[PDB]
Amino acid sequence: AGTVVLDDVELREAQRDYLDFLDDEEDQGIYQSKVRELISDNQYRLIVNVNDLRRKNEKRANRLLNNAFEELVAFQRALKDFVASIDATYAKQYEEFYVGLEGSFGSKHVSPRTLTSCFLSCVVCVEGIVTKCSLVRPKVVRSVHYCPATKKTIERRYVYPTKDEENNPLETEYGLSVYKDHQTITIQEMPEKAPAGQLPRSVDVILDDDLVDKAKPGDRVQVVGTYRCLPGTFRTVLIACNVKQMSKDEDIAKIKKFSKTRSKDIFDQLAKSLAPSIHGHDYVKKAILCLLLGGVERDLENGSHIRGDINILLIGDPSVAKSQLLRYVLCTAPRAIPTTGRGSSGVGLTAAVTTDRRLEAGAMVLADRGVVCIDEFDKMSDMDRTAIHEVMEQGRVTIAKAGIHARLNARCSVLAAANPVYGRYDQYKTPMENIGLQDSLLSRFDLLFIMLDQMDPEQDREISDHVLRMHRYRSAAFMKKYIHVAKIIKPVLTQESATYIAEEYSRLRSQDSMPVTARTLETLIRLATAHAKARMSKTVDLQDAEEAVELVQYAYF
Amino acid sequence: VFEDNIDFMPTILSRFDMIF
Amino acid sequence: LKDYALEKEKVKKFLQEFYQDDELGKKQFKYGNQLVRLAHREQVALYVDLDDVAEDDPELVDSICENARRYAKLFADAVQELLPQYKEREVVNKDVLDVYIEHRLMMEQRSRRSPQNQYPAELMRRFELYFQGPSSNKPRVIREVRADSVGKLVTVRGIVTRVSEVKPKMVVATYTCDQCGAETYQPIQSPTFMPLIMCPSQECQTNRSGGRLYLQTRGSRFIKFQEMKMQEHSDQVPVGNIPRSITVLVEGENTRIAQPGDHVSVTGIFLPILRTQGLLSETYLEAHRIVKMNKSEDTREELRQIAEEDFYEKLAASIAPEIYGHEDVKKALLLLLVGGVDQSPRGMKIRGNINICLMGDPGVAKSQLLSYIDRLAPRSQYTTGRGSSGVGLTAAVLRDSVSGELTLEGGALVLADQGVCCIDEFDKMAEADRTAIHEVMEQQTISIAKAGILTTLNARCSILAAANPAYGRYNPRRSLEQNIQLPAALLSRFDLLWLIQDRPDRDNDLRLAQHITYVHQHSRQPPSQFEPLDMKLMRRYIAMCREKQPMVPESLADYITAAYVEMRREAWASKDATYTSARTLLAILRLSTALARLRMVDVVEKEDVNEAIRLMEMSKDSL
Amino acid sequence: SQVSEHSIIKDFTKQKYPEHAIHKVLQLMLRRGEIQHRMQRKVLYRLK
């Protein structure tokens, strides 16, 4: 704006109070040490805990949170003064310092759903995952114009001044002009907590300098800033002051005590807990239990290799729960998003939006460190087929447009299902081509179950009738609590246990000699990890590892 | 439409009834 | 802040009666000769080395660095005002511009205050001024050039990725009317301008005359113009990102110097472009100096370990540690890692083409090893075989918003300029693309029979190829015409062919299990006490080794000839699917060439040559 | 070659297969992402 007040006493009092806060003399000088760190490290944004501001003066914190603009400006001026007093030269180097807010906020810590209009002109915090994102452009904030004719200099804050007072030419002094970078991003509420009934709230976030590269599309970010309004269409925007990444990852104690392994074998019922109304395919249940669990990050130093990106494909005959099992995972989904068929929503596409060219992250990106449910895999087009092959291997999606080159994190897993177009039995011809998918994609997946309806009336009869009797005329939530605790477990391997896996692995190697053996060695890490994750044990049990060996044998039948 | 009577949706038919 | 008149006088005194210490601390009118040459129209571009100013005027250099365009214009005006005092005779009218300029000066003199009644400064130049970046400012990486440095003279390094043809750009546009008789000038700075319709000349508006104006290209000033995109050096980009591109515009005599794919050093002014909520704009670089690297052409004594320590046991053992063995296979990578950059000064242009082929992608996860090849090797760029479609090499029509009319672009092969070329998923390439590869095999003979494209691509990198097997592992029972699915003649052109079969070698099968078990046990991936070390140390030692340039002895070749003799008996008797020919002799001399670089003796060397023969025998006939 | 799209239909009729069959197979194998379908996508985009 540029409009100022002439010796405001309230502004002066705010400046004095914040300056007193900054000069922590009676305390150890924690913020003063932070000022030293920022001066040395060449960063010009000081993050101040709000809890300290409450402790020193609740009135200051209250007036800040209720009227963001003036208090923020005053506190910025206070920071400038304090820096100059400690070191004038560093202050002379830069134009204006910015201040960020972190800590704990009582009632202003909201969600995009919660962020109604009532929080206008108040500092807010928003939690979610980035959806749309735009490129880095420079935005002008102070343009310096010099007139060669009149020998005068004109400076303006923020059409562009092109003619002087008397239409003389104006050649701008670019160097004296200040340009700051700018970026437009968006956010959506978290998948698990936003109800699926009502419409989603999208909030626009504008980032100033030192914020363009701190958050990238697809991550999980907390944004704190001023919720202002631009001037027939009225749109809310959020000018941000601090961006921090997120994704680090009660009755639990009762759950923990109930889930002690010393009582009985919970794994027997645990596997059945996912397919309540499906008889048989118990091996499939174990694999599906495996897919949800398992680690998704390994400390692969000075490089990268196979990680928790392990996934399961399901191709089989219709009505064999191939379509149905996906819904069971989707219903009890820890951080999982559904997608099916073509799904032309830009897995990494921009759609080339004109009069604007934002980067709309797709389904696989929104599901970072989760599980993705995909129906009718063969329905996806070759355009996706080319992209989807690379995603699973390296773990990121490459966006290739004219000038826009960036990879989004895709630390993800896939649970894919596709109908065998017209294939009926898939027993005489090799599944490598009978499923249509001849591509090398098949090798990438860990598991490929074939759910044929072989005429087995003894086993088949029980599936038809007993499922109908499951109504029970005369524990869904449990797994939810389990998986959250299991996610923070890193079941380290034991060499004596590890050798036991190789010892029986030899017998399988000669069995399949007469399906890839070169990858099977790596997936043995996952399978052993899954069993210990069920027991929350830090070490793999040999008996548990034994069932891992059996699973590979059951894997190919 | 003008398993022998399937044009492009060999799944929708399973979801309906065979009605004349 | 400061009076421009005083600075103009300062630079004038600096050029005219102020001295330097370049030639034995004696003033010799360094710039005076160039000014004289400008007066006689014998030198078109003038360069002002900021280092010369910085030797004895630090404040002027600081002011220039803090603002580039304004001081550039000030220097241009100062040089313009310096010219008339160095006039000695009459201009011999070299071109149309000189003729127009001399008539304009004559007309000015004939009739000899409104600020709009004079010739624009840029129209009467006939000279261009540029700045060379002072060495004091260290070069910056493109990602670190953000909006905060706009308007500051910066220098960045990169590789040219898209250069357009030289075209004329118009600086001053000349309009003449049929009623006024005078010349109307519209200086043009933006890439787009609006032609005039009614002249705003005061004479006509007062006289309410017709004022019909006609644009002409006769007396207009034209300058050379180019558009180039430059991308970061892969060696210094962090692993967690990909290189970014920044637009550079070059004008004047500085053009026609950058070639595609070459390392360039660029110095210019970082300025915004308008394309005509808020005020948005893009960025470009108006270069002032483009210098290529020289490398593009063609304190105790104990600090090194060259001859005493064997390079085989230290260098090889720290290469590709994630790979579970294949030490013999690993050795060939070093030869590939070396390539043919170091060649004898004897016209052996073929030495730098090492087109190694690998068959079998699911085998021992050998797809991973490509990244380590690019990272460690210098002058090497990461490339992907499956990075685009077949349109990436030819020209097609797609929708664009920013720029690009009649797009001409290359593929991954052109992208890596005399470096390491990585190609993946060879099988999935269409039939036409396969021919594109084959024409590369014939030593840069890329002929296109399409009407609009008749380019000649210059492929000089080293090509590594990885190929998936034919939908399963090879089966011996299948005879010829069925056993190998990729065209055999295509494989014939390749110098080296490698295929790995996962045989049930219980001795070797146990080795794989042991190494995967030590994973998840500690942070030392190479448990044989090999530290990864800093990449700085390895690169510095390797660079000085290139300067030695050893040369193999020709006499030793007589020994090799016998090897072809015994091979023929085996080739005829086996009747196997794989077949070799005299190409092996072609390969062997090239193969032996690299190995000897470890021992820089080149008087009597037998073991080095023999090993290359042994490498061929190990892969073929493994049974 | 020589077994292009304009003649493959008549082959079914020669085999006493009416136009009913061509929809079930011919019109459905190209939608599968067959190389022959991709062959038309690249070669015949402008050549026809």
Oligomer: part of a larger assembly
Structural class of chain B: little secondary structure
Main β sheet profile of chain C: 7 strands, antiparallel
CATH class of the domain at 300-616 in chain C: Alpha Beta
* Category from helices, strands and their pairing of chain C: alpha/beta
Strand content of chain C: 15-25%
Strand elements of chain B, count: 0
The CATH level-2 architecture of the domain at 300-616 in chain C is identified as 3-Layer(aba) Sandwich
What is the count of helical runs of chain B? Answer: 0
Shape descriptor of chain B reads globular
Q: State the end-to-end distance of chain C.
A: 85 Å
Fraction in helix of chain C:
25-40%
Sheet with the most strands of chain B?
none
- Round the Cα radius of gyration of chain B to an integer and report it: 8 Å
Which percent bin holds the helix content of chain B? under 10%
Pfam families (chain C): HTH_MCM7, MCM, MCM_lid, MCM_N, MCM_OB
Protein name (chain C): DNA replication licensing factor MCM7
Enzyme class (chain C): hydrolase
InterPro entries (chain C): AAA+_ATPase, MCM, MCM7, MCM_CS, MCM_dom, MCM_lid, MCM_N, MCM_OB
